[PDB]
Amino acid sequence: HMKSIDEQSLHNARRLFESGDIDRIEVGTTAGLQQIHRYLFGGLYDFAGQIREDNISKGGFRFANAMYLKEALVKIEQMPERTFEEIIAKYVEMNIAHPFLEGNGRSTRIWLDLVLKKNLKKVVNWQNVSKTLYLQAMERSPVNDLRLRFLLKDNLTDDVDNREIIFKGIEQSYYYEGYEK
Amino acid sequence: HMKSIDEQSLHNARRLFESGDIDRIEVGTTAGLQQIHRYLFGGLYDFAGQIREDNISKGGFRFANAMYLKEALVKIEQMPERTFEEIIAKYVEMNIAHPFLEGNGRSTRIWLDLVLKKNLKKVVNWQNVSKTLYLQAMERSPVNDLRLRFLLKDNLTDDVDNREIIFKGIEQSYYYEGYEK
Ligand SMILES: [Cl-]
Ligand SMILES: [Cl-]
Ligand SMILES: [Cl-]
Ligand SMILES: [Cl-]
Ligand SMILES: [Cl-]
């Protein structure tokens, strides 16, 4: 049956890695996140790669106000990346920014892995990070990022070029957002 | 017994009105909010009137990141004030900003009343706004400000210079934050 947006986007994510285009993206910047988003969602959402102008929320949580989102992103992208703790803090702020109308979670997890890979030579082995534990750690993270830090730290891998880790991690990441083939 | 910080601050709030200094403050601006805060807390908190550099949270809610708080405040203070709906929206954003380490609620409710008074010739009759209903409306407000809008609209008064409304409203406002003589 015709591919859904999420299914085609998962194919786009796989291609991002298969083609090597993943490693030609800016790391740790707003523009690099936009690049990822455009690769994942170009042709699928008209706003692929575009910073939102509208406010968004999920549950009882409102993401950063569009009114000062661009200003926030400039500060976020200048945050340091030299330790695991710093990188998670930067990720937590980029999640709070949530700069697109859709596709924030999936694009920003790829973004995080590029920052980890560049600075620590590690990535998250997402296939081993449960959806329930991830989502609860993310919900806690604005106030206290310790649960998220430990969850991700416990699931780091140095096998950053392994196909199975990459592809199973894409699958897991998309499953966090509700998609399973 | 020696006055507490909250007790002396309540006296400062009363004096702000008794002296007429209330009506010599900028309305609807960050600087005007700082002015209120300095009047309420000067001599009590070393940070009276000062924009925080640290992050703060209450419950599972983190207020705007200090990292981009100044940038946020510039946008917030430029929000329009010509309708009740606009004024509540501006207030909701200033509450999310929560720009001081302490004293945000009390200072920002005075700030709100000055905006209402200037633009609508009304203020909130806080003595009639229950603490429980206020706090639940405020908790909902980042996502949906309708409950807050209706609660405050239902409690507006045109008797903006009435001593009892003013002084009982200060008392109620301080009680929202836990202080009762
Ligand atoms: Cl930090
Ligand atoms: Cl997503
Ligand atoms: Cl925020
Ligand atoms: Cl608005
Ligand atoms: Cl307060």
Swiss-Prot record, chains A, B:
It catalyses: L-tyrosyl-[protein] + ATP = O-(5'-adenylyl)-L-tyrosyl-[protein] + diphosphate; L-threonyl-[protein] + ATP = 3-O-(5'-adenylyl)-L-threonyl-[protein] + diphosphate. Transmembrane segments: none annotated. Residues 28-153 form the Fido domain. Adenylyltransferase activity is inhibited by the inhibitory helix present at the C-terminus: Glu-177 binds ATP and competes with ATP-binding at Arg-109, thereby preventing adenylyltransferase activity. Activation dissociates ATP-binding from Glu-177, allowing ordered binding of the entire ATP moiety with the alpha-phosphate in an orientation that is productive for accepting an incoming target hydroxyl side chain. ATP binds at residues 58, 95-98, 103-109, 131-134, 177. InterPro entries: Fido (IPR003812), Fido-like_dom_sf (IPR036597). A motif (Inhibitory (S/T)XXXE(G/N) motif) lies at residues 173-178. Homodimer. PROSITE patterns: FIDO (PS51459). Adenylyltransferase that mediates the addition of adenosine 5'-monophosphate (AMP) to specific residues of target proteins. Auto-AMPylation at Tyr-174 in vitro. This is Protein adenylyltransferase NmFic. Its EC number is 2.7.7.108. GO terms for biological process: protein adenylylation; regulation of cell division. Defined as class III fido-domain containing proteins, in which the inhibitory helix is present at the C-terminus of the Fido domain.
